[PDB]
RNA sequence: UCUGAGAGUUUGAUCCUGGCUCAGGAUUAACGCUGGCGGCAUGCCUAAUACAUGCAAGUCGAUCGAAAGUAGUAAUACUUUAGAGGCGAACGGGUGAGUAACACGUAUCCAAUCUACCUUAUAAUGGGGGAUAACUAGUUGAAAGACUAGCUAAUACCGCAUAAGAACUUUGGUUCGAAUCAAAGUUGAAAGGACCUGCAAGGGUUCGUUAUUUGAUGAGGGUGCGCCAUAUCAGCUAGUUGGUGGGGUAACGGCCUACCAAGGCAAUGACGUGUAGCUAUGCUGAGAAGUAGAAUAGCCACAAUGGGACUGAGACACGGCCCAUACUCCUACGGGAGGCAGCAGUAGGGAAUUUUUCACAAUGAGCGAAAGCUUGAUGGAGCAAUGCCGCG
């Protein structure tokens, strides 16, 4: 049973919901008409998974799996210390 | 128009007749289950559940789920 | 047939059951030149193998070039 | 199909009023039992239909009454 | 019993909505119209779906009426609408679908079309 | 190997920038001028406008009744299928209107998937029951037909018994919110063809029956990514956001419901308007790239219009149903019938596109053991110089 797991590294935006946190995640690549590389942002909300708390302040990496509801498949997998 | 069309359309309303008889025997049986809860019913239910499940009128997945539903809130005990 | 009009041709397309012709295919077998019979075409030889192994029983008209090749003499241990 | 013997062509000729509409529309309601016409099995005792000359005329076109 | 300059509604399929009445054919001053009495109408507002325009003379037949009057059965019918079927110089509609109850009481005066049309006939 | 040609135009003459035009091709191009032919491909871009006839899907008599008929004294040899039941009819066709997105394409997790017919191999095929199509009698009718009663066949369907393996549950061993392992609480499957052999009773060949696992095939979901324009579209949205409980669901999920909580997105262009089937690709250019989305292919989506449902693995289904809308057609005026963005074809529009054509010969798909059958799929010929190409 040896899965593949797709891990996003992120900055976390907010908490508004309990066990519900806002994480922001902005990446450089390559825009494909001018040859510079143009920063896009995304935003993903996701959820406690009962072993982590993602705390705002603080970087983090998140990890795809079931659809647990509405505009959440990802759960909180592990903060990397501050600075 | 067609005709084998016409020949599979009176064919399977029977057929559907007697499925939704016994679809309702089956809703009737864990109606009692609602009602009150005891072991020989929920293995009626099982063993009707199998034959509908063995059939194509009832999917398996669906049987099987339930199934599990029913034996989790029995296990209370 | 396809290719040029009054020339026909005939690949040897995969399909298991279902498979509309001029579509997807799951492996080439090879080519065919149906004008001069005399089953010239290249073949893996293994893919023919691939459908033994898993099923999805080919076409019945492409059986005697085929028979030419002999899949039978490397077929018979499907079953033993 | 069969014999020509009993198959026969005939032909109808009237001034206009002296029977074209009378004589051709009475005799196919008197024979015109058959698919082919079958007039009078679907017009026995519905209302009357008398089109007009014009209208009737043109309705009407046709070449073969077997 | 209709009443002389006096809206009413629609029974087919006609793109109108609602129509008045402008003068009933019949004899001089007879002031009331009874079932089958088709009369001179205007409609006052309807939907653009349909084949003439509002305000516009036309002719109609009317069919409903919560008056009715006591035909020969002995026994009396009623109704709760004032209805029209709209027709064309003829015993005819331009309409495709009758919508709502016709009587009967119209056959001896002609009109056939609408009772084979109608989808019921009361 | 790849790597870009100029010319003209404001001025008395004369220079900068700068537009415009030509020399180049390419088209699903009309129409002149017309014109010999061979192949070679193509031939609604336009009203998703409505439409006659033939074709567009059938098949199983080696699963059966059942009546009927050629030859038969009889038994019936044989025929044939209106019918039940079996499979398929959702695959195949064309359209591209609405769709601005998880539609498409790519990489993906499906620790949330399912897939009858095949795949290796396993488990069995015991019997029992009664309706019913068809047929017959009648009411109602030209037909439509409905409603009763009698007559049955079957792999149709409903119990009984029996379970290898399965589900369900409990204990015991496992992995970077899950999986495998021994034991057991619960429970359930069916059928007969065709032939051989055997006096028989059995046994065997093979279809199929019912079950299991490898698979693959097929469909579906999420994910990142890229994939129109518009600021004379500034804020937009409230099952909306979150979880719980419960429900539904091949299956995860406000998918749905109850309880409350209060957000969610946004100037990094949301929301809204025009507009578009998408992509691969076609053309052009030295390239970067720009135009278009012809034929052909893959994905999605539609199917006179809008909804709702059953079928079976599989559909919300060009020619399966129900209703409404709109239209057409028949009629005995009682009442019904019908769906060319299937092929041809018509009517109109339109400058602008064909055959109211042929063989299922090969191949594809469905049925069948097979005779083979069905196929406007497929391939031909018709018309057209419409384009490349040869040739008088």
């Known amino acids: 049973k040896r899965n593949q797991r797709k891990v996003l590294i992120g900055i976390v935006k907010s908490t508004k919901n309990a066990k519900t946190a806002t994480v922001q995640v902005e990446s450089r690549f390559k825009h494909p008409l001018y040859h510079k590389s143009v920063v896009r942002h995304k935003k993903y909300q996701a959820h406690n998974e009962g072993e982590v708390l993602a705390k705002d302040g603080d970087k983090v990496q998140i990890v795809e799996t079931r659809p647990l509801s509405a505009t959440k498949r990802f759960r909180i997998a592990k903060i990397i210390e501050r600075a | ?36 809860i005891n072991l020989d019913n929920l293995g009626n239910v099982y063993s009707q559940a199998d034959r509908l499940a063995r059939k194509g009128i009832i999917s398996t997945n669906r049987a099987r789920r339930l199934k599990s539903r029913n034996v989790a809130v029995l296990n209370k005990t | 047939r396809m290719g040029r009009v009054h020339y026909p041709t005939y690949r040897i397309v995969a399909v298991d059951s279902r498979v509309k012709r001029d579509g997807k295919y799951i492996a080439l077998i090879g080519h ?9 075409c290249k073949i893996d030889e293994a893919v023919a193998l691939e459908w033994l192994n898993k099923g999805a029983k080919p076409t019945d008209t492409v059986r005697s070039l085929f028979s030419q090749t002999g899949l039978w003499k490397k077929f018979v241990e499907s079953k033993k | 199909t069969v014999d020509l013997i009993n198959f026969r062509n005939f032909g109808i000729m009237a001034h206009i009023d002296a029977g074209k509409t009378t004589t051709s529309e009475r005799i196919l309601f008197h024979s015109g039992r058959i698919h082919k016409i079958g007039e009078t099995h679907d017009g026995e005792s519905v209302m009357d239909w008398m089109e007009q000359e014009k209208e009737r005329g043109i309705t009407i076109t046709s070449a073969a009454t077997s | 019993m209709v009443s002389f300059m006096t809206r009413l509604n629609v029974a087919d399929n006609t793109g109108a909505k609602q129509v008045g009445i402008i003068k ?3 004899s001089t001053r007879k002031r009331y119209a009874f079932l089958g009495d088709v009369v001179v109408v205007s409609v006052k507002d309807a939907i653009p779906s349909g084949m003439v325009k509002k305000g516009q003379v036309l002719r109609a037949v009317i069919v409903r009426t919560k008056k009715g009057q006591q035909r020969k059965d002995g026994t009396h019918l009623k109704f ?4 029209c079927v709209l027709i064309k110089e003829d015993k005819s509609p331009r309409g495709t679908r009758i919508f709502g109850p016709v009587a009967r009481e119209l056959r001896e005066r002609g009109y056939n079309k609408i009772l084979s049309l109608a989808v019921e006939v009361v």
């Open chain 2, 1 to 36: 128009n067609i005709k084998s069309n016409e020949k599979r359309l009176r064919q399977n309303i029977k057929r559907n007749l007697n499925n939704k008889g016994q679809k309702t025997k089956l809703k009737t049986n864990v109606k009692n289950f609602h009602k009150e």
């Open chain 3, 32 to 40: 065919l030149n149906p004008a001069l019979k005399e089953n010239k």
């Open chain 5, 24 to 26: 009933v054919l019949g």
């Open chain 5, 80 to 83: 709760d609408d004032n209805a």
